[PDB]
Amino acid sequence: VIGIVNNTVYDPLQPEL
Amino acid sequence: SGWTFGAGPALQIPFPMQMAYRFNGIGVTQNVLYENQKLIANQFNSAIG
Ligand SMILES: *[C@@H]1O[C@H](CO)[C@@H](O)[C@H](O)[C@H]1NC(C)=O
Ligand SMILES: *[C@@H]1O[C@H](CO)[C@@H](O)[C@H](O)[C@H]1NC(C)=O
């Protein structure tokens, strides 16, 4: 993928469990 | 600006994403476009020529 940014993706499961 | 200028104000968008939206609009996910973007552009020139 071109110009894909190095950025974090949140997961709605790890904070919960 | 893709189709945004037709419906109102012209909203700039990178051409590859405009293509991505148009691909999504026909049932082909945008990752197909991004993974083959170079192939598609070179290929497009031969079609215009
Ligand atoms: C976006 O355009 C700039 C030039 O203004 C260029 O240096 C940069 O590499 C481009 N990024 C992509 C992903 O094409
Ligand atoms: C993104 O992170 C990886 C791992 O640190 C690194 O190898 C790569 O060069 C980084 N790319 C950008 C766009 O900074």
Closest Cα to atom 6 of ligand 1: A3
Half-sphere exposure of B8 (CA within 13 A, CB side): 1
CA distance, residue A16 to nearest chain B CA (Å) = 30
Half-sphere exposure of A12 (CA within 13 A, CB side): 0
Let me know: does B15 contact B27? Beta carbons within 8 Å: no
Q: Torsion over CA of B4, B25, B33 and A1, rounded to 10 degrees?
A: 70
Let me know: does B49 contact B43? Beta carbons within 8 Å: no
Stated as kind and residue range, the H or E segment containing B41 is helix B37-48
In sequence order, which residues have a C-beta less than 8 Å from that of residue B7 and are 6 or more positions away?
none
**Interruption sites in chain B after residues (C→N beyond 2.5 Å):** none
Longest dimension (CA), chain B: 33
In sequence order, which residues have a C-beta less than 8 Å from that of residue B18 and are 6 or more positions away?
B2
Please, which experimental method was used? Answer: cryo-EM
